[PDB]
């Protein structure tokens, strides 16, 4: 998924936010990994996407 901008820091046990609690919520006992990377060179439109 792609929530928005650079808000990928919100996917963490304890951190709360707008999209971190209304779209994708992570539990406090989450035992896993988290990967994230930008796509400014793959998903980019001359007039916006």
């Amino acid at each position: 998924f792609v929530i928005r901008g650079d808000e990928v820091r919100q996917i963490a046990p304890g951190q709360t936010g707008n999209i971190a609690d209304y779209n994708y919520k992570l539990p406090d006992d989450f035992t896993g990994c988290v990967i994230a990377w930008n796509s400014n060179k793959l998903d980019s439109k001359v007039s916006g996407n």
Partner: protein
């Protein structure tokens, strides 16, 4: 196993409208999300309409109050009515069933020949 979608097309009709309608075969389509994606060489990603199952639709912020979509279940064929056709609309429109948040069992069609040039 069968698409039965993207049946239609149009010719060069600047400033007019397009009756582009793409039906769907008799299957277990309940939470389908039909949309329209352009396939102009150079600009592959494109979103136009939305087919949320609750009946409500969302239009792109670019073409606000420009495209109107209505649901039709008489012959199981989705309709789309737009106006104010520009000149750069030369592309290949599709009716994709597995839109974003998908791409696991996604399937496409052959394309609707729609092009305009002043």
């Amino acid at each position: 196993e069968v698409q039965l979608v993207e049946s239609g097309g149009g010719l060069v009709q600047p400033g007019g409208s397009l009756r582009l309608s793409c039906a769907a075969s008799d299957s277990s389509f309940y939470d389908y999300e039909m949309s329209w994606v352009r396939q102009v060489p150079g600009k592959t990603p494109e979103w136009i309409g939305s087919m949320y199952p609750s009946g409500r639709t969302y239009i792109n912020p670019s073409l606000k109050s420009l495209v109107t979509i209505s649901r039709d279940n008489s012959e199981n064929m989705l309709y789309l009515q737009m106006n104010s056709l520009r000149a750069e609309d030369t592309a290949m429109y599709y009716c994709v069933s597995n839109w974003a948040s998908g791409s696991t069992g996604d399937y496409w069609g052959q394309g609707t020949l729609v092009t305009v040039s002043s």
